[model samples]
Target: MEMEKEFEQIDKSGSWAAIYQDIRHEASDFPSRVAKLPKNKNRNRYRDVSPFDHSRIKLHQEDNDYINASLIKMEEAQRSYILTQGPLPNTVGHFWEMVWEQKSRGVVMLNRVMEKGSLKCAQYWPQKEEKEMIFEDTNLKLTLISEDIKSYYTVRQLELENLTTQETREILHFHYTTWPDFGVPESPASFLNFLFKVRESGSLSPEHGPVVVHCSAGIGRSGTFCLADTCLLLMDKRKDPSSVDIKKVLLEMRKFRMGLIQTADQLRFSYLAVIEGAKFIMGD
Candidate 1:
């Protein structure tokens, strides 16, 4: 992790290069996607939290599944993502609707169940004693099968059942439960630990179906996760961690999801994480 320390003092504003680079790529679907927002105008968890028009994932072919979400498809890297806002009290049903319709194999939650005295996300998973949480509006039932608590996060094995169809599927919920605000980690290792755990499960693989990654707004932290994941893997394949174009890759991701890597601090942390994470890929 020696390389990690070097990036510790890395200038946060340096990531503007990444943002400007994103603009050079013509044809972002932000406009058209913006136009369609009125349909789900009230379905969003928060006023400011909305999915970018282009990659906003349509959960159901019907009108019901337009839950504020953007699908980030990194086709070349073979990473596809559904970046979404934290579920509101009402949209929890639509949240599950997206999961079921997308055939997602895993859900990665980056925010807290509660943050700064406000509820950042609903406890969508089943509680220990209760064992299940049912959303009657969507006819979705989430049953907890097992739980494993760790220092920084929790792993849950849950079964998602469609009441009408009587079909059930197991989903992995990886909740990274440690963060005060939407701040980046002081140490990238803890995050890479969780990131690789999800990767090892083959959920992030294209064949398994897209993983749904969410934070309060689904951009800042969610963007960081996808950026780091893509760049680290790129380093793994190309054999030169230093040679990979971090800014360029980030811009590509922004094409699918707007306002990705939300702040300069976040953008800075991303470079540090990717650079540090590449060490493992480089067989350090």
Candidate 2:
């Protein structure tokens, strides 16, 4: 399976729109009971994009286990990622709690706090000067110790402390600041650069529970990131990288969370990034 040629064929045939439509048509109608509860309504950023109850991350210590998040595991890649919505103002503490309970070392944020004058996500972390932010509800405190500013992304070193036990852990914040909602980033090269940087951290490995990944609804951009990352890892293990089916990988991911790769453009961008990344994996 020549992934480059496969992508080229799809591009030449201009079949991306049809293929995206087919994915939507083939998606499973998984139940999202917990996300729809009357008490849990405000926790969701989008009414319709809910995590399936089977795979949703349940809070270990909270009275209500519900959160707009899901655990997406691609066992073949030895990867587990927590796909979730941007923290609602009210649920920010719950967001951090999930991070603590899951023992995740990284939080990958794909959208900005404010996009086009709209609040896409709450500002959930502390800035460099602000130093630290504490979540009283979860008894967790996040301290920003160091910050790396890049042209298209930012990496922050955060300290998470469990107030009760007084134990602290270092967490990595990989924020891709430019990805537009329902849109692709500037280019695949930039996106893969960000992806590999996160990979180099080894935070996504099995030793940790799962790396948290989110956009607005936690589906489109987050799905693309996980799908591309997992597929490339799978391709790396294969004798023939072409055997990996991109569409099928997306379908498998959608089973854990709904409405992945929101637009036909996002589906196309995922293919672009995967094909580009596969080249590097194959040493082309």
Candidate 3:
């Protein structure tokens, strides 16, 4: 039960999971009371207090910066680059060339999305051709999912190239769109339901399993999704759901899962998300 041990270590470390536990417990009492307040009342009135804040939740740019810095070192050592948002550039290519020097095992391109016009921002870079070539040669694995939690595609032509495999089975996809009112519990709950279906179907477990999720820049949505998923797994182990603590949980999760719940808005929503998740668990 290494996974369980890992979870315990994370919890003890005051990780993001602990943060979520605290938030969830706090939120449970508010919704019922908040629901009773008048809908569109005046400022300073009890009715005017919004349950969540939209402004404070920005993606973790610092975390991405750290990754980029490490990527440079990784490129120098391994000769392989881990591309995040989009394609690589000439300066990046020069580093890749200096490190990898000789091509071997071909380059593997792993990305979350490959929608047309998606890489528009990085299109003008010099190594775009090399990156596209790597993708064309099957070195790239684009991960995309459809609306119904079924069917994923890396390259659009994958459907055409491997018609047999593509036709034989439906790809498992998690279906939930980010909305203004969306919180951690709602998002993770939807994903967990999808995961349950996949497990029942004998597909795969999330532990070390690869899943690519993206939204425009590939940071905000993806980061939050991961945070919620990790929190859900940790919360499942709590025997006394009523005593969960949010801030402590989050701090621990952040240790290994860096930059998770980056924004203040996301941090606050973690509590609401857990409360909603508790309701679901209780079948209320």
Against the true structure, whose TM-score is highest? Answer: 2
Task: Give one digit per residue, the lDDT tens place, for model 2 in 1-284.
Answer: 46677778888999988989999999878898888999998998999899898999999864788899998888677788899999989999999989989999999999889888899999999986476788898899889899999998999999999998999999999999877644566679989999999999978887887999998889888888999999999988988777999888888888888898988888888888987887787476
Flag the better candidate by lDDT, 1 or 2.
2
Model 1 ranges with Cα > 4 A deviation: 1-29, 32-39, 61-63, 239-241
List clash counts for every candidate, in order.
Answer: 1, 0, 31
Question: What ranking of all candidate models by lDDT puts the best one first?
Answer: 2, 1, 3
Give the alpha carbon lDDT tens digit for every residue of 1-284 in model 1. Answer: 33344355344334444554444444254664542557666676666556666567776655555677888887667678888888877788888988998999999999888788888877777787365788998888888898899998898888999999999998999988885574568888888889989998878976777999998888888888999998877766664555667667877887776677766677777877787677676466
TM-scores of all predicted structures? 0.87, 0.95, 0.39
Q: How far is 220's C-alpha from truth in model 1 (Å)? A: 0.6
After superposition on all CA atoms, what RMSD does each candidate show versus the true structure? Answer: 3.6, 1.5, 16.7
- Of 2 and 3, which scores higher on TM-score? 2
Q: 158-234, model 3: which lDDT tens digit per residue?
A: 11112223322123333243233233333445444443443344222323223323233333344454444444545
Worst 10 residues of 1 by lDDT: 1-10
1 versus 2: better TM-score goes to: 2
